[PDB]
């Protein structure tokens, strides 16, 4: 009923977070942007889902629509 | 820096934390699937377009920044409709 903002949607959070990163660079060699960015999304993504199902990795997999192996593969890339 | 009423900039990783805490809180219990594609497709989408403007359509230079080959970039570039 009072004044209230919208809610930075995940798509808009990236877009404006990236955009502000392509201004503090202003021309300098930067490679592996996809792997760097995916990493900073894939870690929090992976470990936030592991809370909600309390680490039950069988239920973690059904959420992301992944496979247990594929899940535990990326899972093992961060923290067992 | 900003010594003027200004908040702390959501570092991208933090932004992923909050949007999923918030996401899952409103779905605690409902069978949700394909969150990996769904999040990925919501990160790759801006990521491609945002870079695809830093160098103005030059896909060759897009792959030199992103770090993909002109064939993973391309088939991805059009997954999120940027051919």
Q: What's B75's domain CATH number?
A: 1.10.10.60
- The whole-angstrom distance between A34's CA and the closest CA on chain B is 5
Q: Looking at the complex, does the CB of residue B1 fall below 8 Å from at least one CB of chain A?
A: no
| Count of structural domains, chain B | 1
Facing residue for B42 by CB, picked from A10, A49, A66? A10
Q: Looking at the complex, does the CB of residue B15 fall below 8 Å from at least one CB of chain A?
A: yes
- Who contacts A8 (Cβ-Cβ below 8 Å, separation ≥6)? A16, B10, B15, B19
3-state secondary structure of B69: coil
- Name the CA radius of gyration of chain B, rounded: 17
Q: B26: how many CB neighbours lie within 10 A of its CB?
A: 7
Q: Looking at the complex, does the CB of residue B29 fall below 8 Å from at least one CB of chain A?
A: no
The structure tokens listed for A48 are: 């936030």
Q: Angle at which helices B59-66 and B35-54 pack, to 10 degrees?
A: 120
Distance CA(B16)–CA(A48), nearest Å, equals 9
Q: How far apart are the first and last CA of chain A?
A: 46
Which residue segment(s) compose the domain that A65 sits in?
1-80
Does B43 sit within 8 Å of A38, measured CB to CB?
Answer: yes
Distance CA(B77)–CA(B75), nearest Å, equals 6
Q: Which long-range contacts (CB under 8 A, 24 or more apart) does A27-30 make?
A: A30/B65
Q: Looking at the complex, does the CB of residue B16 fall below 8 Å from at least one CB of chain A?
A: yes
Facing residue for A45 by CB, picked from B14, B16, B49? B16
Write down the experimental method used for this entry: X-ray
Phi-psi region of A29 (alpha: psi -120 to 50; beta: other; left: phi over 0): beta
Backbone angles phi, psi at A32, to 5 degrees: 55, 40
Nearest to A33 by CA among A46, A51, A50, A14: A14
């Amino acid at each position: 009923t009072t004044p209230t903002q919208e809610g930075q949607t995940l798509r808009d959070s990236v877009e404006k977070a990236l955009h502000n990163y392509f201004a503090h660079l202003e021309g300098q060699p930067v490679t592996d942007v996809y792997n760097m960015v995916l990493c900073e999304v894939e870690a929090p993504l992976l470990e936030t889902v592991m809370n909600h199902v309390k680490g039950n990795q069988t239920k973690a997999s059904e959420l992301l629509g992944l496979n247990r192996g594929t899940l535990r593969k990326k899972l093992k890339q961060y923290d067992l």
